[PDB]
Design a binder for these strands. Structure first.
Ligand SMILES: [Mg+2]
Ligand SMILES: [Mg+2]
Ligand SMILES: [Mg+2]
Ligand SMILES: [Mg+2]
Ligand SMILES: [Mg+2]
Ligand SMILES: [Mg+2]
Ligand SMILES: [Mg+2]
Ligand SMILES: [Mg+2]
Ligand SMILES: [Mg+2]
Ligand SMILES: [Mg+2]
Ligand SMILES: [Mg+2]
Ligand SMILES: [Mg+2]
Ligand SMILES: [Mg+2]
Lengths: 88, 67, 70, 156, 129, 174, 226
RNA sequence: GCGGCCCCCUGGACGAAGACUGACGCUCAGGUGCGAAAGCGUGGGGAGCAAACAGGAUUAGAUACCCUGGUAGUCCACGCCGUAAACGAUGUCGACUUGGAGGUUGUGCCCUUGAGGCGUGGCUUCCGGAGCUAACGCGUUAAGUCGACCGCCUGGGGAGUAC
RNA sequence: AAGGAGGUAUUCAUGUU
């Protein structure tokens, strides 16, 4: 998964204090970081379906979170996806 | 009965501690069952791993025949 | 089973000890079980049936010591 | 005063080494035409003995039905095994509109006007059990008002 | 997922009566409180109360007369998969008036007798016999 | 003054003792040829077989109304019975007597059964001990047959109470 | 007469069965557990015992026949003594499945026993060659042992008082089938469903059964004295 | 479906106390992905086993069971295939309803007196109550009482066949 | 392979061997 230091770094970057770990932007950033991380793994190990399933769960959860954020506050949604560099 | 590991607060069995494993292997060199020894399951699995590692490092015999 | 003949022990006693060592190591059961290939499904089915009947006998005994027959 | 009725008599068999043994079973219903009804099932070697035993058994084990002027208090549903029965109160003069087993049980229990229908299996034994069960699980204004702590006028 | 809290409430009532429980408890809502008030005024439950500031819990103390449960049958009629609305003329008669249907009219929740007297229709929450 | 059963039962619970193996007194309610009804007063007047109350001559010294002492095994058995044993109390008394014999070098007579793990063994009135094989007898003729199974009045050399064994000896007297 | 918490607790009424055999139906009458043994809450025993005693008093005043049923090896002689010295009937050996429901059969057996008794006090055991006479005597002995306490009831009893409801579950079902009220001493491992007058309490100790039978017999004797 | 041991990369579950977001949830036609064994294509590898095949027997016959050999295949890499008594013959999610004996994996307290006692969560096997069921049986892991959505059934055969 | 005993099975020390 993601190391403790990386998680704390992302929380500091995206949350409005050290202790806000549940906010939607923080969750999406953590999911995006992990998803980008695993691309090397699934570029070398191409028959690891049991892990690719967890990867797809991560992608889908990020989709649901982005949809909620977009429908709840468009400004945060645009800022977040522009910072993270995600299409739609 | 009397799983001898829980009563002594054993955290991990050591493949280096041969004498203990010598108590839990039979004469032929096979692992004695937990149903015989009264060992708890978790320590039984640890014991099996440790005995296999000791066999690999030639501190215990796979069988009696080879040596 | 590597039996050493001890001093003053007769041959009958040595042979009895060797027989008991072999029976305790269970060599012949292993050989008879490895004489022919048995499918994984057959192995699993036999194991499950043995467990079921052993458990049933234990439960029957426990019930018997609860209900008198006379 | 007890009206009695035989609903069905069947010839059952029991294969033995020496051959078949045929015995006769009789289902009967008895009632006082004024709110009490029971059913009995009797088994014998012959029809007269079977009906006699069933009549005695039904004369015992009667139960009480809360009848309102020869009609039911309210629609009732009953079920026993694969037989489901629906009974509805009807205005005076319609008579008893029901199938054979329900017809017998209601006529002997004293219901004079009722709309009925059996769904599922119409096997007489289970139909009789279901309709008797439905007639028993029927509550009248007196008992419902007593149970809910109200007056009958309060319940209307 | 819990998608019919009213049906859950009726189910708890039914199961508590079948299990001879003195009282049953459930999460509270104002619709549940209205239904419990209707049941109490019609004499189907012995009492209700609400305990809690932020997460209210509705407690109903159930009623038994001759050992037997008072509520003989209670079935949700309008449900999320099929809402039922009835004009004042077509309001149902449960057990030919011996029981009561809980109807949600435009002036609050009431029995079918009260709605028919007030000349109102509405949604049919449940039947109670 | 509705004295609560809670506090009354608490008084009762401090009045008695309830643990497996505990040596507890009892009142002998009735005596029969087959069993003896005793009452320690827990859940049921238990019954104990007759031979547990018989001496070497097989005599029932116990009478009705006597207060005896038996070891409760279980307060209940699934059959609504308190289970009591007199032989357990006998073993308790015998081991306390062996303790006193160790203290006072009292010569107790018991059958030195035969060879033990570390020598010979002895058994006396429900107790068991071991004596080193070098201590077979005082005048050790080449015949060891009379060393096992016969009466010896020995003093308790030691006792490993946890092991349920003692150490007998051909002591100064023997 | 009157029993009290002190006497009940002295006799050992409060000890029920182990916790692994209890009845959830019996849960309400259970106080707590101590060393894996249930403790029966005597605060419920005392008023229930008194109400059952009052109803038995009323039936005895209304000349009701009382059937004392207790068939454990621990209460046979106690129940025989209580029903003898209370002018009522008893069963203290195996309960014959169908004593009440198959009364007709029981009554025919009663008649057979009475005929054997007439043969006994008639000089009949003389023409037979001493071995048919011995067989007849032994048959009379067995019939007396089996139906000794119920050879005068004549018809069905008006109430049953049963020790160890679970051991006598058949009698309870017969009484409920025939509409005969049942007053039952119920342990913690028994079902109080078929009982009409529950008296929670230990049903295994001779002291407790002696207490119950003495109180019930005193109440019945006083009710018939009237 | 997964079984020696070790390393590297990696998915999920559960518990303790606390903080955070604030309904973000459930189901899902079409769609996509994974999917035992056999099988197919290309390239290796091939000890044992072994369809087909060869021979020897048994039998009235023996295109089989048995014996002696034995090729594809089983193994690896990359693709295809898309089915099984793929079964708990029991769609997914949520709430409520008496108990007992265990197994495994966490965690709290009391004297841990010494492998103890008293709790509290996860998963899991058996027995059994009410209830349900045509019955067999299921029974807090329901086939009980209900709510949401999705898949199917409409006599046997012809037929899961033809087009 | 046959027969007996104990149990759901061992605590029964170590020592001895
Ligand atoms: Mg995670
Ligand atoms: Mg019948
Ligand atoms: Mg049909
Ligand atoms: Mg699809
Ligand atoms: Mg393949
Ligand atoms: Mg290939
Ligand atoms: Mg090839
Ligand atoms: Mg071949
Ligand atoms: Mg298929
Ligand atoms: Mg299928
Ligand atoms: Mg899904
Ligand atoms: Mg079951
Ligand atoms: Mg096709």
């Amino acid at each position: 998964s993601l190391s403790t230091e990386a998680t704390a770094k992302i929380v500091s970057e995206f949350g409005r204090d050290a202790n806000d770990t549940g906010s939607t932007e923080v969750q999406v950033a953590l999911l995006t970081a992990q998803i980008n991380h695993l691309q090397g793994h699934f570029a070398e190990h191409k028959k690891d379906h049991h892990s690719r399933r967890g990867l797809l769960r991560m992608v889908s959860q990020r989709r649901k979170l982005l949809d909620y954020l977009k429908r709840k506050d468009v400004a945060r949604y645009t800022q977040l996806i522009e910072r993270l560099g995600l299409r739609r | 009965k009397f799983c001898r590991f829980t009563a002594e607060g054993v955290q991990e069995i050591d493949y280096k501690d041969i004498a203990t494993l010598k108590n839990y292997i039979t004469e032929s060199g096979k692992i004695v069952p937990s149903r015989i020894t009264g060992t708890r399951a978790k320590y039984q699995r640890q014991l099996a791993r440790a005995i296999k590692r000791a066999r690999y490092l030639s501190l215990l015999p796979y069988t009696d025949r080879h040596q | 089973p590597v039996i050493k003949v001890r001093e003053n022990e007769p041959f009958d006693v040595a042979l009895r000890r060797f027989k008991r060592s072999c029976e305790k190591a269970g060599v012949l059961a292993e050989v008879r079980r490895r004489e022919f290939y048995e499918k994984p499904t057959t192995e699993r089915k036999r194991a499950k049936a043995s467990a079921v009947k052993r458990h049933a006998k234990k439960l029957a005994r426990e019930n018997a010591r609860r209900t008198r027959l006379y | 005063e007890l009206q009695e009725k035989l609903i069905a008599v069947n010839r059952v068999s029991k294969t033995v080494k020496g051959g078949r043994i045929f015995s006769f079973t009789a289902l009967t219903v008895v009632g006082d035409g004024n709110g009490r009804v029971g059913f009995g099932y009797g088994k014998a070697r012959e029809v007269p003995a079977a009906i006699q035993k069933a009549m005695e058994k039904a004369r015992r084990n009667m139960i009480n039905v809360a009848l309102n002027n020869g009609t039911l208090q309210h629609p009732v549903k009953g079920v026993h095994t694969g037989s489901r029965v629906f009974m509805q109160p009807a205005s005076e003069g319609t008579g008893i509109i029901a199938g054979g087993a329900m017809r017998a049980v209601l006529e002997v229990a004293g219901v004079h006007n009722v709309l009925a229908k059996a769904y599922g299996s119409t096997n007489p034994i289970n139909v009789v059990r279901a309709t008797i069960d439905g007639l028993e699980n029927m509550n009248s204004p007196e008992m419902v008002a007593a149970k809910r702590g109200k007056s009958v006028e309060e319940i209307l | 997922s819990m998608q019919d809290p009213i049906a859950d409430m009726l189910t708890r009532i039914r199961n508590g009566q079948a299990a001879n429980k003195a009282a049953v408890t459930m999460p509270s809502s104002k619709l549940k409180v209205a239904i419990a008030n209707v049941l109490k005024e019609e004499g189907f439950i012995e009492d209700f109360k609400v305990e809690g500031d932020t997460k209210p819990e509705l407690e109903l103390t159930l009623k038994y007369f001759q050992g037997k449960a008072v509520v003989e049958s209670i079935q949700r009629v309008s449900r999320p998969g099929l809402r039922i609305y009835k004009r004042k003329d077509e309001l149902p008669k449960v057990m030919a008036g011996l029981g009561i249907a809980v109807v949600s009219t435009s002036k609050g929740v009431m029995t079918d007798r009260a709605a028919r007297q007030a000349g109102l229709g509405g949604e049919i929450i449940c039947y109670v016999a | 003054m509705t004295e609560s059963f809670a506090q009354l039962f608490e008084e009762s619970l401090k009045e008695i003792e309830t643990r497996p193996g505990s040596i507890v007194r009892g009142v002998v309610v009735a005596i029969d040829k087959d069993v003896v009804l005793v009452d320690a007063g827990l859940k049921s007047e238990s019954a104990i077989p007759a031979e547990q109350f018989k001496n070497a001559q097989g005599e029932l010294e116990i009478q009705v109304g006597d207060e005896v002492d038996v070891a409760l095994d279980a307060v209940e058995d699934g059959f609504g019975e308190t289970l009591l044993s007199r032989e357990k109390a006998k073993r308790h008394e015998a081991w306390i007597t062996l303790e006193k014999a160790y203290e006072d070098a009292e010569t107790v007579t018991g059958v030195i059964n035969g060879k033990v793990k570390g020598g010979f063994t002895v058994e006396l009135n429900g107790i068991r001990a071991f004596l080193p094989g070098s201590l077979v007898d005082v005048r050790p003729v080449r015949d060891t047959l009379h060393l096992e199974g016969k009466e010896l009045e020995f003093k308790v050399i030691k006792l490993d109470q946890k092991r349920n064994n003692v150490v007998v000896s051909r002591r100064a007297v023997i | 007469a009157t029993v009290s918490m002190r006497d009940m607790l002295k006799a050992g009424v409060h000890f029920g069965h182990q916790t692994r055999y209890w009845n959830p139906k019996m849960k309400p009458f259970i106080f707590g557990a101590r060393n894996k043994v249930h403790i029966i809450n005597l605060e419920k025993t005392v008023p229930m015992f008194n109400e059952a005693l009052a109803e038995l008093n009323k039936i005895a005043s209304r000349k009701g026949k009382i059937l004392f049923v207790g068939t454990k090896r621990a209460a046979s002689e106690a129940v025989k003594d209580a029903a003898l010295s209370c002018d009522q009937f008893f069963v203290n050996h195996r309960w014959l499945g169908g004593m009440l429901t198959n009364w007709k059969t029981v009554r025919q057996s009663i008649k057979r026993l009475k005929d054997l008794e007439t043969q006994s006090q008639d000089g009949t055991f003389d023409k037979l060659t001493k071995k048919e006479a011995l067989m007849r005597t032994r048959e009379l002995e067995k019939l007396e042992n089996s139906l000794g306490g119920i050879k005068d009831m004549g018809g069905l009893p008006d109430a049953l008082f049963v020790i160890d409801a679970d051991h006598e579950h058949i009698a309870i079902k017969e009484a409920n089938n025939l509409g005969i009220p049942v007053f039952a001493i119920v342990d913690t491992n028994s079902d109080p469903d078929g009982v009409d007058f529950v008296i929670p309490g230990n049903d295994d100790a001779i002291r407790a059964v002696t207490l119950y039978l003495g109180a019930v017999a005193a109440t019945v004797r006083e009710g018939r004295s009237q």
